[PDB]
């Protein structure tokens, strides 16, 4: 699969029951961050789930429901979740998919080459069922969820206000926290933004590169 | 195309001449980071190039060479490089591929569903010419090259020193900038993670959760 | 494709926006002249652009709208048009196609074996959506638009009057600016051509070679 | 078939006997120009053979050989060639092919949709036996051979000097009879246009737009 | 195709304009004889054409309509006809087909193995549109139209009176111009060949071998 | 199969034993006349066998061996040939194929559609084993062997002298028993025909219509 | 797969490490029992595991190695084995297979329609590599290893001796702990069984039914 | 065909007449037990047969109908049944399938590799047509009908209530005649296990491992 | 399989052990008669076995070995043969095939329509392994062995003596015990049959109908 493609209609087994994806989150009107980790009782994974559980609320806060995945069975899952409450006193309250066989993993390009288990996948899906962004980190390197946070904060704003987010927004070295207007794409769209700039009420390095604070 | 797979043998038209991948870089014993942006003369893409040029030297220290890509021709490639020089006073000195047709884009799944151009793709490739990690952000959201910097600093450590790196490394909530020892995959291996902890040369939360200092 | 086929039903992203081909011209009862050129920001293609532009209102006065094509992206199209104003004091106002990946290109045989970009193709297409003529000129030899001008002029009259046009019409070293009457193709037509002559309503060299003043 | 391909190895029946194309011409280090006309004993076509004959030694002297083609048999050809002598005081002395069934015509895309005869096709092939340009004019509109001369004169020069000819060369509106230099496609190539310019080795409208006398 | 087979439905270009086989003839309750010849302006063929015109009224008085075919174009046909009229003092008035590409030729197996033109093929089709006899002669041997006449006479009488014509009829060595009775094919027909001879209403060599005057 | 095709390698059951066509006759440097008849003990076939046997020595004289065929069996073949001698006082000495299942028939196009036995087919096959002429007469119309004589006669002379025979040769109405020169198919051949006339080496109506006495 | 079939050559990740089946065991001269259990940390499967480990040394004395298998990963295996030692005071020392993707599990037919894990399955494979018996028990019913113990005992002796083993043997209702001689399959084997029974050394109910003490 | 599959609709000839499985039994609300023996008139097979009739009424007490199958025919089936009466005083009141050509055998995978006859297979099918367990014992090792009994018993209970049975039940090492509760597979499901335990209505070892009396 | 076909190479399970067909009879110089019967313990098939045993030494005397077949197994073969002795005081001593699965029954088309077993097939196979005659008799009607005797005597004499046997030989109504000479199939053989008569070595009804004494 690739960005833009509708997330496959698929039936999965989880720690929270058996759910219909992407239906489950979309008929409620909610986005989701589907992320994978290589295996249960593995150190980096454990450190990551930790990060996510300190952050679940902020994602939930922005209408996006986290959801883990692995090629383990729900049994190994709940035994690992329990372990987390007992050794790092943190209770995991986001569903965690058991992909017993690796069908969803494979369907989703989550599994490496000559590997039998997933690596570190992130899938971001909006209420339309559309996969909005994808990330693949390998087993030997854990992610940074604040970057994924940043990303999702940008996706949401992009879709809500019809605008583009610069490099490293809100901390862009050139326009600070300012947002970007999808560049003109016609002659009757240069004309146009050449108004706004010499008129108002829009900042602009040239007709394609135009911006404004939010 | 997938993590751990060999980067494909292809010839590319770039702003620095015609070359062969991965060989061009691997022959010099070098990693390269390959990144696509949608179009030349588009705002985020530009915030992103500026962002990269500001970091070029850091990547290069690590023997990682950035190389850019868009389905645009080389001719507006340079004219766009010039507009970066005239209007942002920064001087792109990393090659950038003219993927006229996007054959290379397609092969690497950088083109989203139903679009005709690339989105924002990141491919980390090492000296063996293995795809180590892959990133796919959409057009609406710029990347953050610092997160890629982190990711590649860690890959170089992982390859170099046979360890793993935890969430948000080197600033993990649990173990800060200490590094992880791969989980035991055999009975025998678990016996000796326990010998390593036996006053020896490792901290732990369990036998599968082992970690030391740099 | 071949002379006399209906121009493919295609949607193309151009500089006056997105438009249905050929419906966007044939619905105004207007012929169009589709022409390809290698790349934006190449010298010859620019000369040809100047040539076309200063010749535009003659094609337009005949009911024939020029439209260019290139494997570059629309953004770079508009910058190149910008360059041509600020450098050749000419305001390009015919629409140009960003065939981003060269699909239309390919579907029209505009790309040379081994190439990834178009040559200098020309397609003349009437208000019936029918391809009337086709020209492939290499990258290295720019066209001379007055020949195209000569072609449409002849084409329009042939459709309008039901006659043919001799070599180099209206400057034909034999019958000058005279039109040719389509050759008799039966034994009857043969007698009609002959009826005429000996009167006559036409001049001829032989029964199959009838010609008159318009 | 498209520009830049090898002209198909094919054995043809002609008015000068049976011969292998392209071999027979390229063996002699010669280019050739193959042109189709719909039918023997037709007017437009007749006027074009006159026009071509009057131009023959001109092509021949550039090292370029004309050769005709229709879907008639050679027995007709000859009667037609004879009619021309008796009637127009012209002796035809270039070979013309009898493509009895239209095999070769079809390979070369010469037959309009729904036709059973070729229209007015033109293929310039060089001594390396490469199709260099192709023209498709319908039966209804005589060619202008002087453009084909223009066209071929320029090809010779492009090949001979490594240059590109502008629009309507050698009468180009911007640069007269000057020949354009292939655009630089690399950073280092741009630095050398920007340096040949300062040293008066070249005029320029920019770094991609450079030119000179031969 | 094969004797007894129904003649294919086909549109054809002829010297009497475009027409539809077999219909054009079968709608008038007419038979027709289709004969190919190699090429216009070839001698044998010319000898055969003259002979066919000498015999045309013969053929038409029987309700059988001759029609030619070669792979030449119609324009070439008419000049050929003219030459005949002006040189042999014979005015050709049966239609002749231009099978530009020899499509119909190929279908009716009129094209010799490895030639590209028809031979001297003859088809006889009745008023039901049925192929009743086929002859295939090579370029190098002219036909004898009389034998076709002899044949076409039999065919008629054959269909008229439900009977067989013997060898070389009406000049047969054993029974002269007497006609043959279709052999008894059953016991209960054998009986009544024998009774009809008992009467004397039939001469016979034996029960199968039965014959009589008309 | 078609004229100019090599006769298919085949093993037949005959009245003179088993033999291999065309090998048996061609390895002997001989032609052969293959002919079919619908069945044994039918009248018209029987009249044709009288006809043939009576001419047998005229074919043989020319070195062509008549060989018959019939979907019947060898036993019937003999009984019928015994009948012919007994009642017609004539003794068949040419071999006759028992195509028991009419395979060689079907291979050879001999069976009418709708039918399960042969019609009246003829094949002239030369010493080279080429199918040189083909004839298909229906069951109800006998042949006239006198034409097939003329036919083979002509076919031979053709081969030996490299000439073509006119319509009805040796009794063509324009040129009697004179032979035809194969028509010039180049301009240089055309001059060679022109020189042959005025040198009185040859008679002619035109450069392409030239003939001489044998 | 099916009884009597050679065991499929496979690479397996185990608790003891990567091994090659059936090789590892067969090269050492040993048999093995491969058995599936549904999942790790599952109650019924824990009872069978415990059951298996009490009995391990009985099986290993016979020259038979047990090897288990689950569809979850190795880390969970060692963590389960852990809990079994902590909560059951027994230290599992046979190899367990982590069939990550349930590959070998589908190969060997271990997974129920509508399911994605293994049930309760037993494969007994001799030193030659041959599957000797196959058991499929569902998840809802634990096995009884004594039965399997019985099974392999019989097996060893069967191969060892060339005798069959009656129902419930060594406790057969009818003939006790005696074993069975293979039923005569020829007339002559009938006559040799009948011999050595009464006035012989062996007992029977009939020529085919023949048993003895061990 | 694997545990859990619907037993295939099929017609079989047996000793009680021609019957439709699994319908015949399941339309009665009865479970059936299908089993294969290698041949009629074999020792092991008769020891298993007697043994089977001895228990028949235990299986029927549970509404489980036993049904036999070999690749012999009905006729010699009944002789064999008769032989068992005459020599072993046991009437046989369960039908036995004549699978004449091994058709149903092959379908149910009861034929060994390289063989032409069934081994010792056991198919257990609940009243819904569901295959519930499968056993493949070789010819040379008679089964143990008692273990099948323990199996069918558990089955009937686990269906009839909603429980799972431990290893060797009703004599398990850890819990004797205690049934087990399906391991918790949701968060909520581990929840209700823990609260139910500390309410002495469930007796446990951990949240998954839960047991009780009838 | 069909008369004149070589007998399939096949290995069979017989009451006389395992043999290869047809090698085990033809290695020996013997013919074999293979007959099938429907099933063991069948009335008709017994009466037939009875009759065949009675005739065994007749078939053997002429070097032909009888061999039986049913789709029953070898054990029910021997029990039935036993029955035949103990019940009709006759001792079967020709081998018989247990075609367990009807594999050879199929190969030979011995199995009736919709049936699952054979009926009364007979195959006479010569020293060279050729199938020489075949008789398909239904279940519902038994063979008359003497006709098979008759047949196989004829068949042997015919092979041995270069001749053919008349209807109901040796009691043919027309020639009694005399034998027929194969019908001449060529003219020269017809010739050589009429010389043999008129000499006095041959008797005759016609040339094709020759007979003589042993």
UniProtKB/Swiss-Prot annotation, chains A, B, C, D, E, F, G, H, I:
Where along this sequence does the record place binding of substrate? 120
Q: Name one GO biological process term.
A: cellular response to oxygen levels
Give the record's GO CC terms. Answer: cytosol
Which Cys-Cys disulphide bridges does the record give? 204-210
* Inducing factors: Up-regulated by exposure to oxygen (at protein level).
- Name the Enzyme Commission number(s) assigned to this protein: 1.11.1.24
Q: Quote the InterPro entries the UniProt record gives.
A: AhpC/TSA, Peroxiredoxin, Peroxiredoxin_AhpC-typ, Peroxiredoxin_C, Peroxiredoxin_TDXH, PRX_1cys, Thioredoxin-like_sf, Thioredoxin_domain
Report whether Coiled coil shows up as a keyword of the record.
Answer: no
Q: What class of enzyme is it?
A: oxidoreductase
Q: Indicate the temperature dependence noted in the record.
A: Thermostable. Retains full activity after 20 minutes at 90 degrees Celsius and 75 % of its initial activity after 20 minutes at 100 degrees Celsius.
Per UniProt, subcellular location reads as: Cytoplasm
Q: How does it assemble?
A: Homodecamer. Pentamer of dimers that assemble into a ring structure.
As for what it does, the entry says: Thiol-specific peroxidase that catalyzes the reduction of hydrogen peroxide and organic hydroperoxides to water and alcohols, respectively. Plays a role in cell protection against oxidative stress by detoxifying peroxides.
Q: What is this protein called?
A: Peroxiredoxin
Give the encoding gene's name.
Answer: ahpC
